[PDB]
Symmetry: D2
Subunit: 130 residues, 4 copies
Amino acid sequence: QYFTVQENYKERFYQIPKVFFTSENYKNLTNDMKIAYAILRDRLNLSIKNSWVDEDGNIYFVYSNEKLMEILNCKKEKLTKIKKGLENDGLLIQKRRGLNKPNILYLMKPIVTERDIYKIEKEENDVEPY
Amino acid sequence: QYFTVQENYKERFYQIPKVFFTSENYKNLTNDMKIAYAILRDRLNLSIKNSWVDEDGNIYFVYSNEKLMEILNCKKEKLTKIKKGLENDGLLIQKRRGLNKPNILYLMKPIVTERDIYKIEKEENDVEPY
Amino acid sequence: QYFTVQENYKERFYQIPKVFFTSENYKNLTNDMKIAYAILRDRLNLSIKNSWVDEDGNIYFVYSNEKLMEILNCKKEKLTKIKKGLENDGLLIQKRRGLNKPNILYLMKPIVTERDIYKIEKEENDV
Amino acid sequence: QYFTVQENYKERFYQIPKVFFTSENYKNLTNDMKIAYAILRDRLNLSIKNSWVDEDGNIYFVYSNEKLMEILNCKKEKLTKIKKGLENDGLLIQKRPNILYLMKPIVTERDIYKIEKEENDVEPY
DNA sequence: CGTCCAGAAGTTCGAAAATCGAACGTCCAGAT
DNA sequence: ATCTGGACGTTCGATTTTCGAACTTCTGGACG
């Protein structure tokens, strides 16, 4: 049948790494942060559009905390709790710059352990016989 | 340039439609509902390996609130709130299997509107000015 | 490890529906025809930007025989051979526009039968 | 608006990486090789199932020319040629039962530029 | 017209935790 | 090294809402 745009945007999502649900490492990470990490993972594209790619070829965020409270839509302490909880797992790294130069942010890929794969094995092969 | 199996399961996500954060008809959903929708909306594949398909070829769930209390990782009261929220916003519809049988559930696709394909687009094309 | 702009574009490909290799219908399709559909498909998310959206949601192309031979990287003799291949399977429809206006192109989603489904499900399991 | 099995199995495809059409390193590949590559890529999900995973985490292939011929749906000759074209472009290797390793494509600084300038390729009004 | 019963929904209240304001602590250049 | 600007973050209770456990209410439809 036809390719409808009405349906096109039904097929656009916010990726959330399954491993955020199997590794005790990412356990301590709440849902408000999980969603956040997804919205950032989405902006990953947008930044390439702004040519935010260092010499070694890495996609970063020159976003001011103001913008983030609009991207992730929340308050001051909220944003913080997220970045701290995130930064305490290897999901996000940041380096200050002082003055008026907005903070540099580097989102990262999570780590998969062989224990994780076994777990996600069930979250997909959990057929009938329990 | 190998295909690391670590990379593979690191590329597995719980897709959450972006129109969820745009349409006011979906603003109701909580960050624990949106994610719940995802987990189940991904379980559709399991539903097929089980033959949970009817005549019109529609794919449904036959999960007891017990299983649902695991898949979403919560308790009745929470699981209830989740279900009633999804259902209230016409995102999931169950058929009240009486007797002693569990509950048959029909997950849904979202309804993307005009101000949705617009609001979502404005972000994907947020190329900083040059 | 960071997100590398290299890996991102390394993971941008063209999609060819698995049904093309299972449905006895789509057995007439040539490899060039399959790939053709694959690329044209990707030009969809791009045809949204050109606002070539139908008032029903349908998405069409306004690509001249030149921009096509350009996209599909081929001659004018090979192009039509493809169009009339993806035409005889309902994968691609055509409607004119007159003299000098490049005819419209609506791309059709493939068709699947119960015989297709089984074939696919089998092809995703082995000993 | 339900979730139908038609739509579900209608949206499962093979993946042929764009860089194959842009980069010069890979320009030397007949379409019969591109698609063949795509199928092998889609074979990975099974490789894991077969437990064909290497200690370093790499996914390999333990197929015979006999079996491979069935997968790609090609003859003895077409195989060696498709397997030689993919091998010379660093997208496949072997350890001459017959063992094979699939490789990801190499992207160059201009590749990004070309791909980027093609998927963002719109036209002014 | 009831006799069945397990799984689903919907109550009551203490315990747990997210939200927020607003002041305090901190960091980073670069000019002193 | 030492001020210092503006932007990042932090510690802290009190107001507000969420969450949990065991109990209770309710929902089917063939069969006596």
